[PDB]
Amino acid sequence: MWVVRYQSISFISCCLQAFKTYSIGRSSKNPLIIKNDKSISRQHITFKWEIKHSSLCLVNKGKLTSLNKKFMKVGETFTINALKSTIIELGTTPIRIEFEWINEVWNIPPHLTQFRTMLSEYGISTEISINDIPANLMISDYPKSEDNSIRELYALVSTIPMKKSRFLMELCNTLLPTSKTNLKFDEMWNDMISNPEYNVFDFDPNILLSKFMRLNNIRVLTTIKSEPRLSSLLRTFNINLFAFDNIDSLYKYVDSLEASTEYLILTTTDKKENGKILCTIKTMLTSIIDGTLSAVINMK
């Protein structure tokens, strides 16, 4: 997303909506007024971007406007590319205006498809396949989520932060139209992003992953042919992952394994059977984060 920010001193910030032609000046008719500076024209500078690749297009309408020390001629068109921030200095006393590209890509559940267009209109990208280039935010409704979902698994192991879906809907419903009405986008974002009632879990991502190390050296034996083929996610935690065509083929292996060998079995279903204890991803996750794994591993 594109954020612009500048400047009783009032810190103003605002999320740039695509295709809208924005403008900074002293004239009241601007979306973003700079007060208290005569070096600032009626309409001093304008800009709009459209759907990396989401570059910003600016055109200087004011007397003094400097980008990285090179000075715009009145009317000159210049652009800012979609790293870090970029600042353009305006006026005699330089008023420093900052344009940041915050490449936000969110992984969302399918029922929230109705919000994708809006999110993209404000530079928040969404995805449904866990794809390959990681996302920075996983919208998830765990524990109210499919029992053999790999999504929470993928994010927990990828230290991607997980937030309830109301976070997504509150952002679109509230802080988006309001950031316009009060030029404090940055404060709202950081309230919403640090507000705990949108958190799925009680610990920071990397702390969550820390609870994932008691796996240590253990055999994980599974009936599940998964999206990012599981073994990948768990190659991280350096764990012997073993897959079987039907729970038959897996029960075979247990007899072959020596006694007092530790294993758990990740199956379609939570239930005890043949003395052994069979669990699913969601139960394994939960026992890990809770620490109650012991009541789920078996030994031979």
From Swiss-Prot:
Task: Name the GO cellular-component terms.
Answer: chromosome, telomeric region; Mre11 complex; nucleoplasm; nucleus
Q: Which GO terms describe its biological process?
A: base-excision repair; double-strand break repair; double-strand break repair via nonhomologous end joining; maintenance of DNA trinucleotide repeats; meiotic DNA double-strand break formation; mitochondrial double-strand break repair via homologous recombination; R-loop processing; sporulation resulting in formation of a cellular spore
Q: Offer an example of a GO molecular function term for this protein.
A: G-quadruplex DNA binding
Keywords (alphabetical) are: Chromosome, DNA damage, DNA repair, Meiosis, Nucleus, Phosphoprotein, Telomere
Domain FHA per the UniProt entry, residue ranges: 22-44
Q: Where in the cell is it found?
A: Nucleus; Chromosome; Chromosome, Telomere
Query: Any miscellaneous information on file?
Result: Present with 358 molecules/cell in log phase SD medium.
Function of this protein? Component of the MRN complex, which plays a central role in double-strand break (DSB) repair, DNA recombination, maintenance of telomere integrity and meiosis. The MRN complex is involved in the repair of DNA double-strand breaks (DSBs) via homologous recombination (HR), an error-free mechanism which primarily occurs during S and G2 phases. The complex (1) mediates the end resection of damaged DNA, which generates proper single-stranded DNA, a key initial steps in HR, and is (2) required for the recruitment of other repair factors and efficient activation of ATM and ATR upon DNA damage.
Summarize the subunit comment. Component of the MRN complex composed of two heterodimers RAD50 and MRE11 associated with a single XRS2. The MRN complexes dimerize on DNA to form joined MRN-MRN oligomers required for DNA double-strand break repair.
This one is known as DNA repair protein XRS2
**What species was this sequence derived from?**
Saccharomyces cerevisiae (strain ATCC 204508 / S288c) (Baker's yeast)
Complete-protein stretch covered: 1 to 315 of 854
